[PDB]
Each structure stands twice: as structure tokens, then as C-alpha cells.
């Protein structure tokens, strides 16, 4: 409540939409740690801003976009995935030992899934209520 109402009050008073997630720390007065925590969870209808990949992860996303053949690459890749099988978990895991410092294999998994479809809803598809529920 405290941080949110403040953030909305600023954005309202300025009369402008968030063009990018970097706009949060640029326009508002929120600290780096809260930005770190929430930036992943804030959608924006700079194309990666409308997806689950976190700003720290953007370098990795750009790297995958270049290897898939970088706004010009991203936009085309976002229309349809050139090659789903192209990435190699062993290649990324081996380079991560010197560029990233960690076993981020699941993160690459999620980046791939995200580039496939931006902010795909994980809720189970809507189904008409069962006769027991109706009763």
C-alpha cells in the first residue's frame, strides 16, 4: 500500500504511461532493492519490458536473440520462434561458469518459454462447473 499508492500518485500526476521498466527508478523514487524485487512482476503493454524476463536477465535474452539468427532480431523472433531446439543447456551451463557465475539452466528454460509467448497466463483454462460444483 505505502509504496504502491506513492508510485501510482506519481504516474498519475505526470499523466504518462510507463514506456519501460527502467522508467520506475528513473521517474519514481523507489530504491534498487524494491525495483529488483518487483520489476519482473510489472507488465507493460524496448520490447522485452512486456515479459517475465527480469532486467538483470536482459543481457541473456539479447544474447539468445542474437544467437537465434538487437531490437531488429527480437521483433522478428517474437513473431515466431525460428528454432525451439537451437539452444543447448550444456553450452550455456559451461559458459555460465565464467559469464553469470551460476547454474542458471532453468532460467534459460524460462527465457526460452518467455520469448515463445510474452507473459503467458499460467492459470488453468476456464471450464464450465461440474455437476457436483453446480449442486
Amino acid at each position: 500500500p505505502r509504496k504502491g499508492t506513492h508510485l501510482l500518485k506519481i504516474l498519475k500526476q505526470n499523466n504518462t504511461r510507463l514506456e519501460s521498466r527502467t522508467q520506475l527508478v528513473t521517474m519514481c523514487h523507489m530504491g534498487p532493492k524494491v525495483f529488483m524485487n518487483c520489476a519482473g512482476f510489472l507488465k507493460i503493454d524496448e520490447v522485452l519490458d512486456g515479459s517475465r524476463v527480469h532486467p538483470e536477465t536482459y543481457e541473456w535474452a539479447r544474447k539468445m536473440a542474437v544467437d537465434a539468427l538487437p531490437a531488429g532480431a527480437l521483433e522478428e523472433i517474437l513473431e515466431n520462434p525460428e528454432r525451439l531446439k537451437d539452444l543447448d543447456l550444456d553450452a550455456f551451463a559451461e559458459e555460465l561458469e565464467r559469464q553469470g557465475y551460476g547454474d542458471k539452466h532453468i532460467t534459460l528454460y524460462d527465457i526460452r518459454a518467455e520469448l515463445s509467448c510474452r507473459y503467458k497466463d499460467l492459470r488453468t483454462a476456464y471450464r464450465s462447473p461440474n455437476t457436483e460444483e453446480i449442486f
Binding site: R2, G31, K33, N37, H54, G102, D103, K104
Partner: protein
Amino acid sequence: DQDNEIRATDLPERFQLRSIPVKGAEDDELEEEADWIYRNAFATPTISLTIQKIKEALGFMRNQHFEVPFIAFYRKEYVEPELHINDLWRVWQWDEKWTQLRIRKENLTRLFEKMQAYQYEQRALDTTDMERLKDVQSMDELKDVYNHFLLYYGRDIPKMQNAAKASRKKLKRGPELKQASRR
């Protein structure tokens, strides 16, 4: 207004609402935390109804200051597959219980230390001070050590505290309200 100083800081809003403020770790007390939480929060209940992962999750919460959802979604490799989102919330809850237990143990230790000083100035506390205060692994047996102390020294706490309040006034020459007979 308290909302202004609370909104100004760099920590999550729910972290200021929490009764136990989030303080950094030392890797040794954090190892003891991971062990304690595993043995108490992931143990068989009475009615019919990984330590490395807990250590990393706690490190995120106390040192990196990451909230549970951030840890779940962006730090999966460190906690999965043995800890899930609800398990992270359970760990974040048990962090409060652990901190209170440790603080209680410390406060009672300082009370025992004062009791030793008081008895030296005037049974006694010889080995039970170190032995029992360090042994306590749960709040339930903490109460046992507190009530055991009160049985013998419960008669003298009021005397010691009223003497301390008088000592403070004499030193000057706070809520220095005396204490009841406690008979």
C-alpha cells in the same frame, strides 16, 4: 506520519510491517537456522494429516533481502526441487519464530548473569547458566528453563529490580516503577 518514513526506505513494504526486523546473517547462525527450521518446521505432526535449499533461501531473505515470490520465481535453481512457494512462505514465517527464540534465550541469559552478580554481592547458578540456556532448542522447553529459574530466584527478582531502580536513582544523585511482592 509513519507512512512517510516507512515508504522512504529501500525495503519491501511487508518487511517493515513484520514485527521482527530483517537483519543480516553470519553464516554460522544461519547454518543453525537452516538446521533448526528443518528439524522443527518439517517434522511429523501429532495428528494425522533440503537443508542446503533452506540455507540459500534464508541467505536471500536475510542478506539479499529478496521476498518469497522473487526467490520462488527468479531463484528456482537455488531452492528447487525440494522447496516450493508454500515452503518458502513457511520458512519466511519460521524465521520470526527462530529470531524470537534466540532473542528470548539471550535476554534470559543476561537475566541469569545479573542473578549471579546479585548472589555474589549478597542454591546458586553454577553450570545451569551455560548448560540450559544453550541447550534450549524450542520455545516449549524455553518456558521450562524460565519457570525453573523463577522457582528458586522468583522470590528475589523483585528485590533485585527494586534495588537496580534505586541504584539508578542514587547514581544520578525511565519507568522506575517498583515490583510486587510476588508471594
